Design a protein around this ligand. Structure first.
Ligand SMILES: CN(C)C[C@H](O)Cn1c2ccc(Br)cc2c2cc(Br)ccc21
Length: 107
């Protein structure tokens, strides 16, 4: 499997998440799913989560959607769009520390 390269993307395999300049809309898109700077301030998770802003069609590409699916925040239904990002984090939540499993030291 794989994905098709895109020059119109904002994220790249280097920096990660630009919280300092994170789009307002996108900002709430995270706080709603249950994600903090801790998950965005990690080059390891920054990519693991990019599968969302990447698959969704695009961060700015989502703004045009958020405008249709809702209004200006508030507190009306947390699902829809955000409910998906919650499932993407579950994948990492299920993993405790199996990736780094293999003790060789004795004593
Ligand atoms: C349609 N796809 C292929 C294009 C990009 O994969 C979509 N995309 C963005 C577009 C604009 C900005 Br600004 C930020 C992002 C972004 C951030 C993360 Br993390 C993951 C995917 C992201």
């Amino acid at each position: 499997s794989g994905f098709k390269h895109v020059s119109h993307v904002g994220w790249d395999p280097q920096n990660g998440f630009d919280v300092n300049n994170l789009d307002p809309d996108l900002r709430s898109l995270f706080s709603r799913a249950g994600i903090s700077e801790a998950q965005l301030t990690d080059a390891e998770t920054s990519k693991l989560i990019y599968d969302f802003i990447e698959d969704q069609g695009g961060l700015e590409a989502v703004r045009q959607e958020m405008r249709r699916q809702g209004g200006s925040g508030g507190s009306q239904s947390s699902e829809g769009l955000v409910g998906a990002l919650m499932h993407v984090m579950q994948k990492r939540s299920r993993a405790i520390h199996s990736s780094d499993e293999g003790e060789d030291q004795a004593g």
